[PDB]
């Protein structure tokens with residue numbers, strides 16, 4: 001079995017190997033990459049996402065989110081307080097202000113220590129989940145707006161045509177902005193490209209061990225767990241690496257830098273934080289191997305998770321027994 005310790009793997013495809021996206025995902029899996037839940041892909045030196053980032057300041061962040069924490073430094077939840085709209089230029093200035101800017105630090109490990117010590121005492125503002133793309137239309141390789149759609153994959157595997165669309169999303173971050181522990185909708189893959197700015201640190205649990213994280217989470221957030229049998233779908237809970245290690249949960253960590261892709265694999269729980277002002281693009285995708293994970297994915301039906309239009313067909317076709325309860329939670 002390849003990669004039996006479930007380490008995060010880093011790949012360096014050549015320009016020729018960068019042509020066929022599906023083929024390269026399958027190659028990474030042949031080497032055991034999915035066992036980690038997360039892989040890094042460094043593009044060939046000949047590749048670029050677009051020419052420059054000099055002209056992005058007028059993009060609007062209609063609903064910036066202030067991420068307010070509750071709990072203790074290593075075990076906390078966050079809620080999202082909606083703020084007034086602002087442009088990317090305005091948000092960048094805000095990220096760089098004395099109130100929000102990254103502190104002086106020695107290296108990524110020192111900054112990680114500072115994150116986990118001090119995150120809860122601040123409320124950073126995240127420009128997350130903005131429909132759009134920064135890939136040039138002429139970029140033909142690993143262009144996240146030109147991937148095969150998940151509806152097409154389901155139709156190809158299973159023969160049923162379904163409604164829905166699959167488009168990318170932009171994330172504008174600042175120091176301490178946080179993504180809570182989660183797997184993707186319907187335990188899909190995700191791919192994330194860091195277009196510009198400061199790094200993003202990731203934590204990940206191997207898919208074969210995801211239920212160990214779920215059991216810890218129920219212990220640590222007992223009110224939330226009574227509320228909902230799949231409350232990590234709410235995407236509000238944080239648990240630090242120190243707490244994971246104290247509880248024997250298998251995990252890994254890695255830092256993504258500008259110009260690098262990350263892929264998350266089906267049922268790979270992940271969480272993390274931004275180092276300073278940055279912009280990432282991400283989208284969900286599927287392969288043949290995903291279908292079995294989609295059929296078995298948990299679902300939140302308590303009302304909290306609320307999701308896109310396109311999840312309806314995935315539940316309806318892959319999980320008909322659960323569909324009526326899930327859709328009530330949508331309503």
Ligand SMILES: O=C(O)CNC(=O)C(=O)O
Pocket residue numbers: 128171178179190191192264270280282283
């Ligand atoms: O970058 C973030 O805030 C969150 N990203 C992801 O969870 C992802 O790409 O799958």
Ligand SMILES: [Mg+2]
Pocket residue numbers: 055056057058059
């Ligand atoms: Mg602009």
Ligand code: NI
Pocket residue numbers: 182183184190264270
């Ligand atoms: Ni994700």
Ligand SMILES: [Zn+2]
Pocket residue numbers: 227228229230231233234300301302303304305
């Ligand atoms: Zn729920």
